[model samples]
Target: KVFGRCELAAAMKRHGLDNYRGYSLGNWVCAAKFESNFNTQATNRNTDGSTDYGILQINSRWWCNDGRTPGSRNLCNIPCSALLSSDITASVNCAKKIVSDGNGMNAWVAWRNRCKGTDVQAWIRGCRL
Candidate 1:
């Protein structure tokens, strides 16, 4: 599902991601924008042959199972399809675990290249929630 920026922000806030795992909401918003453009169904195949799943683009290699992606660790222990839902609770939960596993937002190359060391407030600008 595709979401507007404000709608995505509100959803993230509702999921307790405003400052989840010590990362700012702006950082999360920025990462999501670059990762999947707020579309829950978005997916991408990495050069490493792993596929990224869902809005945060969690990797199939270490996070979830798509069955087709080989060498999956399934660390999140959920189907990769679960992250493709508009509800996003599953994706957020998995992302929390990813952050806690020591990579923080750095786990996402999108965040590292696009959001790191950048002022992310503009990503949430005009989202009054």
Candidate 2:
């Protein structure tokens, strides 16, 4: 269920390896592991035909439709692109947005509390970054 390690590592590095090293890297890795089992090719279908794609399971249709450029379709096609777009700064900013948005890390903490930190099922939910 893992995307090849080199590709995943490259993706992580491009996004923000320096900020997410050690425990932070572990957390992010745990999150990715939990989300899609690190599978770069994975996708999930909604009730509609729209889809979540790649390692982070980014939905190309929604993102492409929502102000993201159609050419950015690569964002959901390649796992590396999903992790860190060619523009490094933008990629890092986007990653930050994801961690800081919505229920996000808070949801992770809540799930951790509920699971008592014993369940691997709570991996992404346990991740803070």
Candidate 3:
């Protein structure tokens, strides 16, 4: 399931991403754009032998367990494949865990490169939230 900008923003805000850990919904909305283009089934294989799963690209090496990542931390405590579900609850919660962790929103390089310290209001413009 791919989401539109406002749609994903609305969804994310419903999960309390707005000002979460000092990061705005725009940061997350931008993350979905760069990380997965809001496509729930996105899977990007990393050069470091880790796999990035689902919309927010939860990594198998640290967040989710894929069993193939070798010594995965599985901090999200769910299978990596679960992130691919069209229902984004798991992915959203996983992203939340990532932000609430020590790194905050810096976990995603996409967010760092694209959304960080930028005028992110453009990402959320016209969204009723």
Candidate 4:
């Protein structure tokens, strides 16, 4: 809902996600594509009874409070609904913290299964950054 590929790349660059914590912009872009297709309002329930939130598909199990779930670690200290907004600052910041914890982009299954070692130039093909 917030961005196309180019707009997303530009916004992400402005947020300093182009190369944060040794991960490339393409990595983030590709993961975002698979996770939410650039839809900020996206959400999905997991088989384990938890949910994934927003564009990055961040898990409620560890990242944010979904209210229904008790004792969520809520590592980002934010409400999961916040991640569904058009402003990606909270989501990006939380993602940065996640990558910094040493999981890198591997924290996202989409990154490992679809993006790793793949040619990701298309993610930013028409984007000017």
Candidate 5:
């Protein structure tokens, strides 16, 4: 499922992505734009034999176990399939865990570097609960 910008923002906010680990909705939403374009079923393969999965393009190597990505240290303790669901609850919880690792939002390198030059605060402009 592909969600519009604000639509996905609302979805993320609904699942506690707003201000999660001190990252605002703009930060989260902007990252999603570059990661997967708000698509719930998006997937990508990495050169490290780890496949990025689901809405947030979470890598299987350190976040979830896909049974195929070697050295997968399932830090999220959930199946990789969980992140692919449209409901996003599983992904949201996993994202929180990722952010809680003391590295801030750097776990998702695409959030800033890949999506540079855009104002995250502007990403949520005109959006209201």
Candidate 6:
């Protein structure tokens, strides 16, 4: 069976993300935890007037073509709300997209370089991610 909160949290802790550069990995964790309890199947009726689905809270209609993207393996169909839907890679990618879409990748890269030692919250907010 796939791992749950405790297992995933342990892995994240081991990665130094628990305190990586003073960045509270818990922020992300809280967002994921509160959103889905780490369930890949989590879905929410977006109050933002959009339909959000899956772990990273992806907009299924927009991103997954309303679930019409055939054979798109992994958590492609599940948005980003669920946080972990058996595909961490896809989840991260989707988060990156959600975080960086407005600013673009180059801006994000530049922001990363400039915000290295700053507080994670500040950096994340600065990047508007």
Best candidate according to lDDT: 1
TM-score of each: 0.94, 0.46, 0.95, 0.95, 0.92, 0.47
Ten contiguous residues minimizing lDDT sum, candidate 3: 96-105
Q: Compared with the true structure, what per-residue lDDT tens digits does model 4 show for residues 5-108?
A: 88888888889998798777888999999999999999999877789999999999888999866656899999999999999999998999888887788899
* Candidate 2 lDDT tens digits, 1-129: 355444455566566753442224445455455556666556566565555544554544434233333434443223434432323333344445545545443333322443324443333343233
Off by over 4 Å in 3: none
Look at candidate 5 and give me any clashing residue pairs: none
As a whole number from 0 to 100, the lDDT of residue 80 in candidate 5 is 94
The TM-score that candidate 3 achieves is 0.95
- Model 6 lDDT, residue 61, Cα: 41
Residue-pair clashes per candidate, as listed? 0, 1, 0, 0, 0, 11
- State each model's CA lDDT, in order: 0.90, 0.45, 0.89, 0.89, 0.85, 0.46
lDDT tens readout by residue for model 5, 33-89: 888888889999988899998888888999899999977799989999888888888
- Ten contiguous residues with the weakest lDDT in model 6: 120-129
| Residue-level lDDT tens digits of model 1 in 21-102 | 8887889988999999989999999887889988999999989988887776999999999999989999999999999987
Clashes of 2: 1
Residue 82 shift from truth in candidate 1, angstroms? 0.9
Model 1 scores what on Cα lDDT?
0.90
The alpha-carbon RMSD values of the candidates against the true structure, listed in the order shown, are: 1.1, 7.9, 1.0, 1.1, 1.5, 9.5
Error of 5 at 91 (Å): 0.7
Pairs with backbone N, CA or C atoms under 3 Å apart (clashes), candidate 3: none
Better of 3 and 5 by TM-score: 3
What's the lDDT for candidate 4?
Answer: 0.89
